[PDB]
Structure 1
Amino acid sequence: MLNTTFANAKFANPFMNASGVHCMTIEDLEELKASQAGAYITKSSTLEKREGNPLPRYVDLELGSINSMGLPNLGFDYYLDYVLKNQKENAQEGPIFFSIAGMSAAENIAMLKKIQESDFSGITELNLSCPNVPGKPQLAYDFEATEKLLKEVFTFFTKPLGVKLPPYFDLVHFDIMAEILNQFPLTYVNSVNSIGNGLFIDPEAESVVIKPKDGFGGIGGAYIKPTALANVRAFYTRLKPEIQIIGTGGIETGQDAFEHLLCGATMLQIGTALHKEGPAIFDRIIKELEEIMNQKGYQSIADFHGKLKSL
C-alpha cells in the first residue's frame, strides 16, 4: 500500500525520522534500519565534533516540544564513514539520507565537495534553517545568500540534493523561493524545520524551561502542523515537478500523515513524536495510514497524493 518512489529510488513506505531525532550515533541509526521506517536520515553534521548547547535543551510539551540543541553531532567524517560502510552491505531498500548543516557557507561547500568526491550514492540534505545556533540567522530567510550559495553548489555537486527549509508565512516568500529553487537540478525540498525562536514558560517557577538563548527554542509537534501543511502545499503548487517534497511537521497519527500526502508530500519525516515514542512509532503510524486508506478504498498513495480539494 505505501510503496513510494522518490528521487528515482524505491522505498517500502514514505516514513522517516526527521534529522536531529534518533539519529546521533551509529546505534541510533541501526535502530532506525531495524524499524519499519521506509527510510532514515543522519543528524545534521558540521565539519568538526560539537558538544552543542548547555542543558536543559529539549523539553516535551503537551502540544509538542521545544529545543535548542545547538547542533550536537559526532562530526562529518563519522557520519560519512557510517553511510559508506552501510551501502556496501546492501542491507536495506533504498538509500540513506545524509544531512549537513555547516556553520558557514564555506563549511557547507567543503562538506559538499567531500560527498561528491566520495563513493556515497545516497541522498544529501543541505540544512539551511538551523535556528538553535547563537549568532547564525537561518540562511533560508536571506534570499540573496540562499541563491548565491546554491549557484555555487550546483557548479560541482551532481549527486541527489535536497534542502531543509524553515517555515514561511507570507505567500510572496513562497514565490521568491520557488523562483530560486526552480532554476536548479534539486531533487527535493523538505518543509518544515522548527517554528523558530518560540518561548515556553513554567508559570510556577516563573521561568523559561531551556537554558540556551534565554529559553528561546524551535517549536515542533501539533503546534506547527498548520504551518507545515501550508508550507508543503504552497511549494507543491509552485515547484517544478522534478523537485519533489518531504513533508515534516506535526506528524503523529495516520491522519496527520494523510494530510501531508494530500498536500503533495512524497516522503514524511517524524521528529517530536518519534522522540517521545521511539522507533516503534513507524509500525503504529503505518497501520493507521493503511486503515484510513482501506476505509476510503484506496490501495496506493497515488489515489490521493496531492489531491487536497479547495472549496
Structure 2
Amino acid sequence: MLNTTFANAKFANPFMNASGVHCMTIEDLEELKASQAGAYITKSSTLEKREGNPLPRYVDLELGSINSMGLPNLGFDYYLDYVLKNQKENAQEGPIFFSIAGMSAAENIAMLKKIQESDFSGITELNLSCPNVPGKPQLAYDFEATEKLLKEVFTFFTKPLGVKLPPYFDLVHFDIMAEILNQFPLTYVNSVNSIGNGLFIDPEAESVVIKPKDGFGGIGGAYIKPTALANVRAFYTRLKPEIQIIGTGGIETGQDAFEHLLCGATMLQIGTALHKEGPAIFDRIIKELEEIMNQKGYQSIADFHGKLKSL
C-alpha cells in the first residue's frame, strides 16, 4: 500500500533514515539496506574526512534530541566509492541518496563536479543547512548566497539533485525561497534539518549537556514536528509540481508519517527516532501507517497525499 514514485524512481515505501543518523559507515549503510526502509541516504560528506566536534555532542531528550556533531564523516571518496560499487550489484529497489555538505561553496562545487563525472546514477542531496559547524552559518538563511550557488551548480549538474533546508518561520521567507528554487530543474526539497542552535540544561548540575558551542545544538524530535509539518506544507503549496518534497522532522509513529504525507511530503526521513530505536523502527512505523490507512479504507498514499484540509 505504501508503494511510492519519487524522482522518477520506484520505492517500496516512503521511509528513509535522515542524513546523519545510522549512515556513517558502510556497516551502518548495509544495516539500512537490510532494514524495511524504502530508501536510505549517506551521512553528509566533506572533501576530507572529519572527526567532528568534541564529546559529548549528542544527547537523547524526553521530547527529542540535541546535538552538535560537527559533520563527522569518512570523506567524500569513501561514500562515492561505496555507492558506485553497490550500484553495480543491483541488490536493491530504488537508488541510494548521496548527501554532501561542503565546508565552502568551492567544496560543494568540487564534489558535485565529481559526482557528475562519476557513473553515479543515484540521487544527490545538497545540504544547505548544517547548524553545527562553528563559524559557518546555515547557507539557506542567506537567500542571495543560496541563489548564487544554485545558479552555478545548474550550469553543469544534470543528475537528480535535492536540497536539505533549515526551517523557516515567516511566510515571506517561504515565498522568497520558492521563487528562487522554482527557477531550477531541482528534483526535490527536503524540509527540515534541525531547529538550529537550541539549548538544553541540566538544572541539577546547572550546566549545558553538550560540549561544543557552549551547549548550543540542533533540536530534533517531538519538539520540531509543528515546524517541520509547516515547512513541508508551505513549500508544497508554493513549489512547482516538478519539485517534490521529502518530509523530515518529528517522525516517530505512523500518525506522524500520515501527517507529513497529508501535508505534501512524498518521501519521509527519520532522524531522532531512528537514532534511539535502530533500523527496527522501519518495520514498526510501516505497520502503524498501514493500520491507519486500513482504518480509513485507503489502499494507496495517493488517497490522501497532500489533502490536508483547511478550516
TM value normalised by structure 1: 1.00
Post-superposition offset of 1:139: 0.1
Deviations 1:191-246 (A, max 9, x none): 00000000000000000000000000000000000000000000000000000000
Residue equivalent to 1:193: 193
Q: Indicate the SS of the match to 1:94.
A: coil
Deviation above 3 Å: which 4+ runs of structure 1? none
Residue equivalent to 1:254: 254
Post-superposition offset of 1:106: 0.4
Post-superposition offset of 1:85: 0.3
Post-superposition offset of 1:130: 0.4
Post-superposition offset of 1:9: 0.1
- Amino-acid identity (%): 100
Q: Indicate the SS of the match to 2:87.
A: helix
Deviations 1:94-125 (A, max 9, x none): 00000000010000000000000000000000
Post-superposition offset of 1:72: 0.1
Post-superposition offset of 1:265: 0.0
Q: Distance in 2 between matches of 1:226 and 1:262?
A: 14
Deviations 1:56-88 (A, max 9, x none): 000000000000000000000000000000010
Post-superposition offset of 1:51: 0.2
Post-superposition offset of 1:30: 0.1
Q: Which runs of 5+ in 1 are unaligned?
A: none
Post-superposition offset of 1:255: 0.1
Q: Distance in 2 between matches of 1:68 and 1:188?
A: 26
Deviations 1:159-187 (A, max 9, x none): 00000000000000000000000000000
Q: Indicate the SS of the match to 1:305.
A: coil
1:137 aligns with 2:137: yes
Post-superposition offset of 1:257: 0.0
Q: Distance in 1 between matches of 2:88 and 2:137?
A: 38
Q: Indicate the SS of the match to 1:24.
A: coil
Post-superposition offset of 1:275: 0.2
Post-superposition offset of 1:129: 0.1
Aligned length: 311
Question: What RMSD, in angstroms, separates the aligned Cα atoms of the two structures?
Answer: 0.2
Q: Indicate the SS of the match to 2:167.
A: coil
Q: Distance in 2 between matches of 1:79 and 1:208?
A: 33
Residue equivalent to 1:43: 43
Q: Distance in 2 between matches of 1:103 and 1:166?
A: 16
Q: Distance in 2 between matches of 1:92 and 1:291?
A: 26
Q: Distance in 2 between matches of 1:200 and 1:238?
A: 34
Q: Which runs of 5+ in 2 are unaligned?
A: none
Q: Distance in 1 between matches of 2:91 and 2:101?
A: 27
Q: Distance in 2 between matches of 1:120 and 1:280?
A: 29
Q: Distance in 1 between matches of 2:208 and 2:235?
A: 34
Q: Distance in 2 between matches of 1:229 and 1:299?
A: 23
Q: Distance in 1 between matches of 2:128 and 2:106?
A: 13
1:234 aligns with 2:234: yes
TM value normalised by structure 2: 1.00
Q: Indicate the SS of the match to 1:258.
A: helix
Residue equivalent to 2:66: 66
Deviations 1:241-278 (A, max 9, x none): 00000000000000000000000000000000000000
Residue equivalent to 1:25: 25
Q: Distance in 2 between matches of 1:83 and 1:119?
A: 10
Post-superposition offset of 1:304: 0.1
Residue equivalent to 2:305: 305
Q: Distance in 2 between matches of 1:218 and 1:267?
A: 22
Q: Distance in 1 between matches of 2:217 and 2:41?
A: 22
Q: Distance in 1 between matches of 2:132 and 2:260?
A: 25
Post-superposition offset of 1:41: 0.1
Q: Distance in 1 between matches of 2:20 and 2:306?
A: 27
Q: Distance in 2 between matches of 1:228 and 1:49?
A: 30
Post-superposition offset of 1:189: 0.0
Q: Distance in 2 between matches of 1:275 and 1:157?
A: 32
Deviations 1:127-166 (A, max 9, x none): 0000000000100000000000000000000000000000
Residue equivalent to 1:172: 172
Q: Distance in 2 between matches of 1:79 and 1:210?
A: 28
Post-superposition offset of 1:6: 0.1
